[PDB]
Amino acid sequence: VLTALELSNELAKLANIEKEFKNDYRKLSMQCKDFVVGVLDLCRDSEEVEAILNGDSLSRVKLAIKYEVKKFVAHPNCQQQLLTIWYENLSGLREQTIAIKCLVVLVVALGLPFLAIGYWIAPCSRLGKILRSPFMKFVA
């Protein structure tokens, strides 16, 4: 999978450099991307999905983002893992409606100075884990 990602990037760079056989190199890079996406698609356990998404820190997801391997990142096997970290330390809030999320954003907007000053003790408190989740960082 790492070999296919690197080869896809190299073939895309060659497609840019040549411009004569750009279609050939783009087709080859698409072949590499398709291979990576299929190998990810074969996963049927969390262990396999993790092994694909980071090698031996989502390393392969970051590499695919860098190399514009869009179908690998957008695959449900990767998306579920990304949502796992995204909605970390907060499980019920994932299932809430969009209106509840907007209300949470409004509450955070109202009370941002209070939580900011409480961050001096938050890591020793439970609320520090809540505010340190990626979704809460985005909301903040």
Partner 1 sequence: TSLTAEEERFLDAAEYNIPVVRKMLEESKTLNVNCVDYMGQNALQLAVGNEHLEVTELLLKKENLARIGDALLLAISKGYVRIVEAILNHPGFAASKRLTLSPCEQELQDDDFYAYDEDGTFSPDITPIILAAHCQKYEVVHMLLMKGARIERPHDYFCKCGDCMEKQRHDSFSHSRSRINAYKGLASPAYLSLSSEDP
Q: Which residues bind partner 1 (CB under 8 A)?
A: 44-47, 49, 77, 80-81, 84, 95
Q: What gap in Å lies between CA 125 and CA 78, rounded to an integer?
A: 31
Q: How far apart are CA 33 and CA 48, in angstroms?
A: 19
What is the token pair recorded at 73? 């990142």
- Closest separation in Å from C-beta 53 to partner 1: 11
Write down the least CB distance from residue 131 to partner 1, Å: 24
Residue (35 or 87) nearer to partner 1, CB:
87
Rg of the Cα trace of the chain?
Answer: 20
Q: Which one, 19 or 44, has the nearer CB to partner 1? A: 44
Closer to partner 1 by Cβ: residue 16 or 84: 84
CB-based contact 140:110 (threshold 8 Å): no
- Cβ proximity to partner 1, 61 vs 131, nearer residue: 61
Query: Residues with Cβ < 8 Å from 67, sequence gap 6 or more?
Result: 5, 8, 9, 12
CB of 16 to partner 1, least distance (A): 37
